[PDB]
Symmetry: C5
C-alpha cells in the first residue's frame, strides 16, 4: 500500500486502524469545532451594534473568520468520517481510500483567510502610536502568507520525508516569530492612552494570542513530540492533533474575537461593561 | 461481533435488531429535536428587541445554544439512519457498520457549548446580591466542563466496562450537584428586588432546570434502570433514551430560554407581556 | 415480504410498485410542499413590521411553524425518493429497503410543534371575553398532544392491525373534537366587539381551520376510504394521501397565517387594510 | 427498456445517450438557473426599502418566487446528474434508473407558487382604472392553476401518448390565452395616469411577459418542433429544452421583478432612479 | 479510453492519475475559493450602510456576485473530489467516471452573472462624463456575453480539437479587448471630478482589473503554455489552472468589490478612510 506524501493519520489508519474511542472522538471534536464557529458567527453579527461605529468592522471581520472556519471544519468533519470505515472482523476503523486520504492541508489554505483577518482586525480597535498602520498590516499579511504556505508544503512530507517536514517547518517558524514580534508591538501601542480596563484586556489578548497560535506548530509536530515510535505516533496522537487544532481554533478565533469585542465596548463612548 | 467500547444501541442493533416502530420512532424524535432547535433559533432572534438592551445578550446566547443543538441533533438524526439498515429476510433494522457505530458522545462534547452558555445567560437577566458574577460564572464553567468530560469518558464503557461506566458517572454527578447548588443560589439572589411576577418565573425556571438537567443522567443510566436483562436493555430502552434526550433538550434549552425571555420582559422598564 | 408495522405505501411499493406518474407526482407534491413553507417563512419574516407590536408574535409563530414544516417536508421528500427505486425489467418503482421503509410518522411528531403553535398564535390577535387565555392555551396544548400521540401510535398499524388503527384513530378523533370545540369558542369571543372586516376574516379563518384540519384524519383513513381492495388501496391512494397532506399543510399553516396577518392589520391602530 | 409515461430525455438517454457537451451543458445551464435565483433573492430583499412602503409587497413576492425557483432548479440540477451516468466503453452518458427517471414535472407543480405570485405582484405597483383588484387576482389565479395542472398531466404523455400530450396542451393553451388577455388589460390600465417613463417600463414588461411566458409552451413542444424524428428529437433537443426553461425562468422571474422594482421607484414619491 | 470533447484534467486523470499533493491541493484551493466568496458575501452585506445610499447598490451587486461564485465554486469543489478516486495499488487518484467527467465550463456559464454585474457595479460608484450609462452598460453586457459564450464553446475542444480551441479562444479575446477598452474609458471618466485619493483607488482598480481578468484566458491556455508535451500538460498544469482561477476569482470579485467599497467611502459625504 503506497500512500505517498500523506498525513500520518492515514498510516495509522491503514496499519493499526482506529478504536471506537479514537475514531468517534476525532469525529466529535471536529463537530464541536464547526458548531462553535457557526454559533460564533451568530454572536458576532448579533452584537455588532453594541459598540461604536468605528469598532464594528472588527465584529464584521470576526464574522468573516467564523464563516471560513465553519465551512472548513464542517468539510473536514465529513472528510474524517469518509476516510475511515469500520472493519467488522477486528472492530476497528481502517483507511477507506474510496473516501480520499485524510489531509490537514485543508486547514492551512483556509488560514490564508483566517490569519490575515485576525491580525488585521485588532487594528480597528486599538490605535497605533509609533507604528504605521499600513506597515503593520503589510508585515502581518506577508509573513502570514509565507508562514502558511511553507507549513503547507511541509506537512505533505510529515511521513514521507522528515527532513523536508522539519526544514519547511523551521522556515515557517521564522515568519511566525516575526508575526509574534509585530503583534506584541501592536498590543503595547494599543495600551497607550486607554483605560486600565482596556489595558487588562489587551494583556489577556496577548497571552491568548501567544498560547493559541503556538498550538498550531504544536499540532504540526504532534506525531513526533514523543520521538520515533513514541506514544503519540499512534491513534492517541491522531486524537491529540485534532484536539489541539480545535482548542487553538476556538481560542484564536472565537475567544480572541470576544476579547476584542469587550475591548471595543470599554473604548466605546456610549457603552459600559 | 467485536464492537469494543460502543454504546448499547449498537449491541441491540447487532443482535436483536430494531422493529419498524423502534427504528422509525428514534428517527422521528431526533428529527423533531433538530426542528425545534431551528425554530427556536428563529424565535430568539426575532424577539431580541422586545426586551431592554441590557437583557438582549440572553436572547443572543439562547440563539447560540440553538445553533449548537440544531447542528448536533441534525447530525445525530443522520447518524441514526446511516447506522442501522433494514434486513428484508427478518424485517428488522440491524447494525450497518459501514455507517459507523452510533455514539451518543456527539451530544456530550457539544454540551461544552450548551452547558456553559445556558448557565451564563441567566446572569444577564437576574442581578446577584452577595455572590460575585465572575465567581458564579467560573464555577459554572469549571464544574460544567468536568461534569461533561467525565460523563463523556464514562459513556464509552456503558457496555464494555460497567464499573468504569458507574465510577466516571459518579464523579460526573458530584460536579452536577455543585452546579445545582450554585444555580439555586443564583435563582434566590435573582428573586431579591424584583416584582412577584418575576419571582414566580424564576421559581418555574428552577423547577424546569432541576428536572430537565436531571433527565441527562437519566439517559446515561437508561439501559440499566430496570437492572440486568431488564425491560430497558432492549429497543424499548433505545427509544426511551432518545425520547428523554429530546425532552431534556427542548426543556433545558428552548423552554428555559423562553422563560428567561419572559422574565426579561417583566424586568423591562417600558415593555410588557 | 416481512414489513411488520409499516405504512401501506411500502406494501403497494413492495407488491405492485409505482408507475412513473405515481412515483414522480408524490415526489413533486412533497417538493412543492417544502418550497411553499420556505417561501412562507420569508413572507412572514418580511411582513412582521406591517402590524402593531402586539400582533407581531403571530408573524413570529407563523415563521416558527414554517421552519418546522419546511424541515419536515424536505426530509420526507428525500425519504420518498430513497425508499422506492426503479426496476428496469418492469418499469416501475419498487420498495428499496436500503433506503428505509417510508413512514408518515415523521409528520406526526413534528405536529408537536405545528399544532400547539398554530392554536396558540390566534390568541395573540383576538381578544377573549369570557374564556381565560392560559386555560384555552392549556386545553389546546393538552388535547393537541394527545390527538397527535394517539394518532401516531395508530398509523403504525394501518396495515398490520386494522383494529388498533381504528381504535387509536377514534381516541385521537375525540381530542380533535375537543380542539374544534375550543377553537370555535375562541373565534366567537374574538368576533365580539371588533370591526366588521375583522369579523369577516375570523369567519373565513374558522371555515379554513375546520376543513384543513379535517383533511389530516382524511389522510389517516385514505387507503380504506374506498373499503377493502378499493380504488384507493393502490398507488392512486398513495398519491391521494400526500396530495391531501400538502393541501392541508398549505391551508392550515400558510393560508391560516396569512389570514391571521390580515386580521392583525385590520385591528392595527397605526395601519390601514 | 420499459419507461412508460416518461419524458423524452429518458428515451434519448436510454438509447443514444448524451455526449460530454450535451450532458455537461444541461448540468451547467440548470446550475446557472438556481444561482441566478438565489442571487435574485438577495437582490430583492436588500432593495425592499428603496421603494415606498406601498410597493414593497412586490419586492417580497419577487423574493417568494426566488425561493421557489431556487429550490426547484437546485433539486432539478441534482436530478439531472443523478439520472445519467457515463459509460466508459463508448464515452457517453446513459439513463441510470437507480437515480430515478428525469421528469420536468417538478417545475410544473412549483409554478403553482411562481405563476400566481408573478401575476399578483404587478397589482401592487400599477393602479387599475376599470378592473377590480380582487377580480383580476381571482382570474389570474384560477386560469393559472388550470393552465399548470392540465399541462402537468399532458407532459407525462409527451412520448407515450402524443394525442393526450397535444389535447391537454391545447386545453392548457386556452387558459394561457385568458391570462395574456387579462395581463394586457392590467398593463394598459397601469399606464393610465403615470409618467411616460413608467409607461415605457410597462411597455417593456409586456414584451418581456409575452415572450418569456410563451417560451414555456415552447419547451413543452420542443422535442417535436422539428417534427417526427427531427433534429430536436435528440440530445440537441434536450439541451434546447433546458436552455429555453432557463432563459424563460430568468426573464419571467428575475428580469420581470427588476422591471417592476424600477417601475415602483419611478412611482415612488421621494426616490430617484 | 474514450472521453470525447472533455477537459484535459480527465485525460491526465485517466492516464497518469494525480499524486496525493496534486489531488489534495486542487481540492484545497477550490475549498478556499468558495470559503472566500461566502465570507465576502457576509462582508458586503454587513458594510452596506457604511456608504451613502447612492453607492449601496454596488455593495448589493458585490453580494450578488458572491452568491454566484460561492454556489459555483462549492459545486466545483464537490465535482473535483467525485471525479477522481484513489487507486490503492499505485497510490494515485484516477478518473472515476461514475462521478462524471470534470469540466471547467461550470465556471463559464456562471460568468453570465459575474461578468455583467462586476462591470455594471462600478457605474454606481463613479460618475461618467461624456459617456452614457446605458451605452456603457449595453456594451459591457453584449461583449461580456459573447466573450463568455465563445470561450465556453472553445474549452470543450481543448484536447479534442486544438484548432477549434484556438479559434473560439481568439474570437473570445476580441470581445475581451473591447471590454478592456470600455472599462479604461470608464476609469478615466470616473477620475474626473473626484479627490486624488479616489483617483489613486481607481488607478489600483484598473491594474487589478487588467491583471485579474487576463488570468482567465491564462487558465484557458494553461495546459499548452509550455507547448506540446510541456511541463504544464500534466498534474502540475491541472494544479496551476485551478490556482490561477482561484487567484483570479478572489481578485476580480472580492478585492475588486473591496476597492470599489473603499472608493464609495471616500466619495461619501459623511464618511472617510
Ligand atoms: C477539583 C478537581 C477534581 C478532579 C477530578 C478528576 C478525577 C480523575 C480521576 C479519575 C480516576 C477514576 C478512574 C476509574 C476507572 C475505573 C477502571 C475500572 O473500573 O476497571 C475495571 C477492571 O478493569 C475490571 O472490571
Ligand atoms: C468549547 C468552548 C465553547 C465555546 C463557547 C461558545 C461558542 C459560541 C460563541 C458565543 C460566544 C459567547 C461569549 C459570551 O457569552 O460573552 C458575552 C460578553 O462577555 C458580554 O458582553
Ligand atoms: C515547528 C517546526 C520547527 C522545526 C524544528 C526543528 C528544525 C531543525 C532544523 C532542521 C534540521 C533538519 C533535521 C533533520 O534533517 O532530521 C531528519 C532525520 O535525520 C530523520 O531522517
Ligand atoms: C493545551 C494543550 C492540550 C494538551 C493535549 C495533549 C497533547 C500532548 C502534547 C504534548 C505532550 C508531549 C510532550 C512531551 C515531550 C517529551 C519528549 C520525549 O519524550 O522525547 C524523547 C524520545 O522518546 C527520544 O527518542
Ligand atoms: C520545538 C519543540 C520540540 C520539542 C519536542 C521534544 C521531542 C524531540 C524528540 O523526542 O527527539 C528524539 C528523537 O527520537 C530523535 O532521535
Ligand atoms: C414539542 C416541542 C414544542 C416546542 C415548539 C417551540 C418552538 C420554538 C419556540 C417557540 C416559543 C413559544 C412561544 C412563546 C411565546 C411567549 O411565551 O409569550 C410571548 C411574550 O409574552 C411576548 O408577549
Ligand atoms: C465521588 C466524588 C469524587 C469526585 C470529587 C469531585 C468533587 C467536585 C465538587 C465540587 C468542585 C468545586 C471546585 C470548583 C472550583 C473551580 C475554580 C473556580 O471556580 O474559582 C472561582 C473563581 O476564581 C472566583 O473568581
Ligand atoms: C450517574 C451515575 C451514578 C451511579 C452511581 C452508582 C454507583 C457509584 C459507586 C461506584 C460503582 C462501582 C460498582 C462496580 C460494579 O457495579 O460492577 C459490576 C460488575 O462487577 C462489573 O460488570
Ligand atoms: C442513582 C441510582 C438511580 C436509580 C436506580 C434505579 C434502578 C433500579 C434497578 O437497578 O433494578 C434492580 C434490578 O432488578 C437488580 O438487577
Ligand atoms: C378511556 C378510553 C377513551 C378515551 C377518550 C378520551 C376522550 C377525551 C375527550 C375530550 C378531552 C377533554 C379533556 C381535556 C382536559 C384538559 C386539561 C387542562 O388542560 O386543564 C385546563 C386548564 O388547566 C385550565 O386553566
Ligand atoms: C379517524 C379514525 C376514525 C375511526 C372510526 C371508527 C371508530 C370507532 C370504532 C372502533 C373500531 C373497531 C372496529 C373494528 C373493525 C374491524 O376490525 O374489522 C374487521 C376486520 O376483519 C379487521 O381486520
Ligand atoms: C369519537 C369517535 C369519532 C369517530 C368519528 C369517525 C368518522 C368517520 C369518518 C369518515 C367515514 C367515511 C368512511 C367511508 C367508508 C367506506 C368503506 C366502504 O365500505 O366503501 C364502500 C365500497 O366498498 C367501496 O366503494
Ligand atoms: C375547455 C376550455 C376552457 C378555456 C376557457 C378560458 C377561460 C377560462 C376561464 C374564465 C373564467 C373566469 C375566471 C373564473 C373564476 C374567477 C372569476 O371570474 O372571479 C371574478 C370575481 O369573483 C368578481 O369580483
Ligand atoms: C402548446 C399546445 C399545442 C396544442 C396543440 C397543437 C397541435 C395542433 C396541430 C395538429 C397536430 C396533429 C399532428 O401533428 O399529428 C402528428 C402525426 O403523428 C404526424 O403525422
Ligand atoms: C472576430 C469577430 C469579433 C469582433 C470583435 C468586435 C468587438 C466589438 C463588438 C461590438 C461593438 C459594439 C457593440 C455594441 C452592442 C450594442 C450596445 C450599444 O452600444 O447600445 C447602447 C445604446 O445606444 C444605449 O445608449
Ligand atoms: C465560426 C467559428 C467556427 C470555428 C470552428 C473551427 O475552428 O473548426 C476547426 C476545424 O474543425 C479544424 O479541423
Ligand atoms: C499569478 C501567479 C500564477 C502562479 C501559477 C504558476 C504557473 C505558471 C504559469 C505560467 C508560466 C508559463 C509561461 C510560459 C513561458 C515558457 C514558454 C515555453 O516553455 O515555450 C514552449 C516550448 O519551448 C515549446 O516546446
Ligand atoms: C505569459 C504567458 C506566456 C505565453 C507563452 C505561450 C507559449 C506557446 C508555445 O510555447 O508554443 C510552443 C509550440 O507551439 C509547441 O512546442
Ligand atoms: C501549486 C503551484 C502550481 C505549480 C505546481 C508546481 C509544484 C508542483 C509540485 O509540488 O510537484 C511535485 C509533485 O507534483 C508531487 O507529487
Ligand atoms: C502541543 C503542546 C504545545 C503547547 C505549547 C504551549 C504554548 C506556550 C508558549 C508561550
Ligand atoms: C428517565 C427517568 C429519570 C430517572 C432518574 C434517574 C436519575 C439519577 C441521577 C443521579 C444523580
Ligand atoms: C411574440 C410572442 C412569440 C415569442 C417567441 C416564442 C418562441 C417560441 C419557440 C421556442 C424556441 C424554439 C427553438 C427551437
Ligand atoms: C522537533 C521534533 C521532531 C523530532 C523528530 C523525531 C524523529 C521521528 O522518527 C520517525 O518516527 C516514525 C514513527 O515513530 C518512524 O516510523 C520513522 O521511521 C522515523 O523516521
Ligand atoms: C445505578 C444503576 C446501575 C445498575 C447496574 C445494573 C447491572 C447490569 O448488569 C449488566 O446487565 C447487562 C444487560 O442485561 C448484561 O448484558 C451484563 O452482562 C450485566 O453485567
Ligand atoms: C373508513 C374506515 C373503515 C374502513 C375499513 C375497511 C376495511 C379494509 O379491509 C382491508 O382492506 C385491505 C385493502 O384491500 C385488504 O388488503 C385487507 O386484507 C383488509 O383487512
Ligand atoms: C404541434 C407540434 C406537434 C407535432 C407532433 C408530430 C410529431 C409526432 O411524431 C412522433 O415523433 C417521435 C420522435 O420523432 C416518434 O418517436 C413517434 O413515434 C412519433 O409519433
Ligand atoms: C498559444 C498557445 C497555443 C500552443 C499550441 C501548441 C499545441 C500543443 O500540441 C498538443 O500538445 C498536446 C499535449 O502535449 C498533445 O497531446 C497534442 O497531440 C498536441 O496537439
Ligand atoms: Na466512517
Ligand atoms: Na437506515
Ligand atoms: Na428513487
Ligand atoms: Na451523472
Ligand atoms: Na475522490
Amino acid at each position: 500500500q503506497e500512500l505517498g506524501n500523506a498525513n500520518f493519520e492515514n498510516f495509522i489508519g491503514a496499519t493499526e486502524g482506529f478504536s471506537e474511542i479514537a475514531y468517534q472522538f476525532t469525529s466529535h471534536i471536529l463537530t464541536l469545532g464547526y458548531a462553535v464557529m457557526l454559533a460564533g458567527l451568530l454572536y458576532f453579527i448579533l452584537t455588532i451594534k453594541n459598540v461604536d461605529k468605528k469598532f464594528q468592522m472588527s465584529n464584521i471581520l470576526s464574522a468573516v473568520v467564523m464563516v471560513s472556519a465553519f465551512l472548513l471544519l464542517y468539510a473536514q468533519a465529513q472528510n474524517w468520517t469518509s476516510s475511515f470505515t469500520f472493519n467488522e472482523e477486528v472492530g476497528r476503523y481502517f483507511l477507506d481510500p474510496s473516501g480520499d486520504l485524510f489531509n490537514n492541508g485543508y486547514r492551512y489554505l483556509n488560514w490564508l483567510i483566517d490569519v490575515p483577518m485576525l491580525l488585521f482586525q485588532i487594528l480597528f480597535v486599538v490605535s497605533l502610536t509609533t507604528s504605521k498602520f499600513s506597515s503593520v498590516r503589510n508585515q502581518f499579511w506577508f509573513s502570514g502568507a509565507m508562514m502558511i504556505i511553507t507549513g503547507y508544503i511541509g506537512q505533505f512530507y510529515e511521513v514521507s520525508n522528515l527532513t523536508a517536514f522539519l526544514v519547511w517547518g523551521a522556515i515557517s517558524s521564522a515568519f511566525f516569530f516575526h508575526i509574534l514580534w509585530v503583534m506584541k508591538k501592536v498590543i503595547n501601542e494599543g495600551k497607550e492612552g486607554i483605560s486600565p480596563a482596556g489595558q487588562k484586556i489587551l494583556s489577556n489578548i496577548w497571552i491568548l494570542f501567544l498560547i493559541s497560535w503556538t498550538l498550531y506548530p504544536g499540532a504540526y509536530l504532534m506525531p513526533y513530540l514523543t520521538g520515533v515510535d513514541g506514544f503519540l505516533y499512534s491513534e492517541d496522537g491522531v486524537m491529540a492533533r485534532q484536539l489541539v487544532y480545535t482548542i487553538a481554533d476556538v481560542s484564536s478565533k472565537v475567544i480572541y474575537g470576544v476579547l476584542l469585542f469587550n475591548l471595543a465596548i470599554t473604548l466605546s463612548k456610549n457603552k459600559e461593561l
